[PDB]
């Protein structure tokens, strides 16, 4: 499997350990990650789509063209980028008026989208093309802990175009985390949003933290030792939001947060330093003691 690795913004510029963890985990699973040189912001679908739809799709199609020129499909570890690039590709394939508008704009920069790019999320790529059995085979250090799985919103939704199954009762990530030796604990409002999406973190910070606080509380009540996600933004919201929750609401949890790549990395014998678990705002050390 060969895929143009779209990095995005938060993973490459904030949580770099998530990148390093993905690079080795995907290599161990037999996936050749090729550099998507010059790739910019996806751009953020909820944030930019809200300011100007034409700009969101035109800039998204510009990134798709990079992978199309390389003659390979795209892979990403972020729901925001997945949702943005996947919905852009679908819309350009299904709507010719939108494709014409975008190609008329891309002609100014010597580009043209032809509709040959398929966008994939690393979690579903692992579930449908590689297999959950291959995860267990590569487990060097079984992580026997309770995990509050966080699917996010832009991973499975909208189901009408994603076609990755149920968004109300999914099993995809639960089966992937359970393959590392962990246990996906069921909690209240499991499929609810972390609160960061749609530009809410930047404009209404306290509102976004109220939703993250509820998710953390529900995970802790379910007996979770940590929470696993598939989105650098959800990861940021859970990891750094706790500092803001402590400074704004006065509530302290010190709840460990691990990205699926970082969780898969720990399981595949990666060194916590190579995984960069120490950099996290909220210390992962309490979780490292449990494993």
């Amino acid at each position: 499997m060969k895929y143009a690795f779209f990095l995005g913004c938060i993973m490459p510029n904030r949580y770099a350990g998530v990148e390093a963890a993905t690079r080795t985990v995907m290599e161990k699973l037999g996936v050749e990650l090729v550099d998507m040189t010059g790739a910019s912001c996806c751009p953020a679908p909820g944030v930019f789509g809200s300011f100007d739809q034409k700009t969101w799709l035109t800039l998204a199609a510009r990134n798709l063209c990079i992978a199309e020129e390389m003659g390979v499909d795209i892979v990403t570890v972020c729901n925001g980028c997945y949702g943005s690039l996947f919905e852009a590709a679908h819309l350009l394939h299904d709507n010719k008026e939108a494709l014409n508008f975008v190609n008329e704009k891309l002609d100014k920069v010597g580009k043209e989208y032809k509709g040959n790019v398929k966008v994939r999320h690393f979690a579903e790529l692992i579930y449908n093309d590689i297999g959950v059995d291959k995860i267990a085979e590569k487990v060097e250090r079984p992580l026997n802990i309770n995990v509050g799985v966080h699917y996010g919103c832009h991973f499975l939704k909208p189901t009408d175009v994603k076609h990755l199954g149920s968004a109300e009762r999914p099993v995809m990530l639960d089966e992937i985390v359970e393959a590392t030796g962990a246990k996906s604990v069921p909690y209240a409002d499991k499929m609810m949003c972390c609160g960061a999406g749609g530009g809410v973190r930047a404009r209404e910070l306290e509102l976004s933290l109220d939703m993250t606080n509820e998710k953390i509380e529900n995970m802790i009540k379910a007996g979770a030792d940590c929470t696993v996600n598939v989105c650098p933004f959800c990861h940021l919201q859970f990891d750094r939001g706790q500092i803001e929750i402590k400074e704004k609401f006065g509530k302290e949890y010190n709840f460990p947060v691990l990205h699926l790549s970082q969780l898969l990395g720990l399981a595949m014998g990666m060194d916590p330093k190579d995984l960069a678990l120490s950099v996290h705002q909220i210390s992962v050390d309490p979780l490292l003691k449990k494993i």
Binding site: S166, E168, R169, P186, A188, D189
Partner: protein, 652 residues
Amino acid sequence: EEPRIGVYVCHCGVNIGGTVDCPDVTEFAKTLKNVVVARDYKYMCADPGQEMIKKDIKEHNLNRVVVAACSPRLHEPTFRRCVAEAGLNPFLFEFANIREHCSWVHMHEKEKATEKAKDLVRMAVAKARLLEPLEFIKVGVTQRALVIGGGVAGIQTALDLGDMGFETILVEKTPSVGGRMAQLDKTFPTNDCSICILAPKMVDVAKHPNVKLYAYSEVVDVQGYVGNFKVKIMKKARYIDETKCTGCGQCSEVCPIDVPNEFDMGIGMRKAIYKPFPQAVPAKYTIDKEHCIECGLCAKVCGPNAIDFDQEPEIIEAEVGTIICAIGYDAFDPTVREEYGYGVYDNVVTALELERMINASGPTGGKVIRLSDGQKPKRIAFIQCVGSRDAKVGNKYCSNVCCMYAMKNSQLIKEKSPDTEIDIYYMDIRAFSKGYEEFYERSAKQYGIKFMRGRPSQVIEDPETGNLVVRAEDTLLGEILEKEYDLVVLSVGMVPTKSADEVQKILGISRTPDQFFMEAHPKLRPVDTATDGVYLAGACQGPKDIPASVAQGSAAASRAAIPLAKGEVEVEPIIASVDAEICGGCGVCVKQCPYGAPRLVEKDGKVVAEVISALCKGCGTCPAGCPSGALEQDHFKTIQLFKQIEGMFRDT
């Protein structure tokens, strides 16, 4: 004689005229060869419109008539009878569909719609020129009817036809008649005991001298046409001697296989050997071979030794004139709406399961209890429109009875336990018939039932207690509610029954967007189908309540009694025939007919094909496949269709 065509362009008020420029189409029709009269009128099917055609046929000596209007599926018979009254053969009449196929679908493209109407008129005129006079074939009508489905609708049709003096056959799939009405405890808006009022009709139909009841039987084949149907009924084997069966029920105690009781909607557990419900008609037991292990333990306890595994199903061949489909409906499966947690949460039930829990002869002995701990719920929530008015589940229709049964069952629970708190989560309360609005007023005023306008977003279970929380916006307050309940009842909608696909193929009938059976016309013929001699009655035609199903049962009896009473019906002579001078007996046609009409025979010392006219249904498959052109379907001959194709581009 050369064709003399009369072209009539209908306006249909403004349905056609408002989009298509009818006067301009009328002027264009006059430029076509053989067209000698062309007129446009507001309503061609009305008395003045029909009299105008008749008067012109006589005054202008027309031998062809073209009506550019609605669909032939609606008024082709109407105009055929109109032209026949003026002396013109009904097969010299041609329909041009410029409403459903043009004005109604090209409303924002008036000019192109007008040009399309001109081409459709030219295509009609082109086929009309080569149409030939055909003799309507007169056929006899077998004085016997067939009713498929023994629910309140089917029972009513059979009783009415039987009471009229017509021999009737009633086929019921399950071991007993009664349908879903037998599963209900009470019935809105009178709150009468459902079985206590249906049982007399079940008793009446079982001993009626003009009704032959075939319970635990299915129609496996239907062949023929109106007045001449040849049906095959498979009398399923109960593996228990029917006549030696007492109906006591002592051989079930020993059976080791537990099957979920269908009659109790899966809540109850029955054995492989059983009786649907205590008031079943006919009152006899049955063995389910789909779950039977053939251990023979039941036979050891059985005194009469009625148990016989060597029983064989009997195929009964019967001849009938008319058929009435009254197979009912099934309750919607709410597992798909995952946010509600049906099939996941123990205390989330459907309304049909509640009917059984409430029913005295039910699995809980008439006690409403939580399936998680067996305790009576103190707080109950009803969720309306589950599986209805929902594009996500593909059901964009109103199931018609859910508002009323939710309010009814809420009154029944309040009567049994007044302390119970009941909230109904709705969008619109649909209490549209006689005494329904009053029933709704009564539910709130007398029984204290509460109504929350707001369709719930999701149901959340407390894993510790089994209690459920209903998340919904109270739209009348603009606030989000998160009330807790001991039991959540999903007011499930109606869907076609599981066997509907099998019955559709056997009868050759169509379905409407809601997946129920299609009536010939929503207002001109609510219980007829486009297939002559086949009628509909009850919930299988669309979601509806008991009086509506009962009225449809009676309506179907009247409509199905017309051909029987007449004793003679007319069938379309659009059949295939072989030109002996051209057929060299290649045998290609023989296997193409599913009815076996074309057959090879000896004529003038050589082999040729010949069609048994009576077996031809007029599909046009064998003439299309004939390599010599000897085979032709009257009214759809290759030359006629060829001119119709030319008519789209030029006058032929």
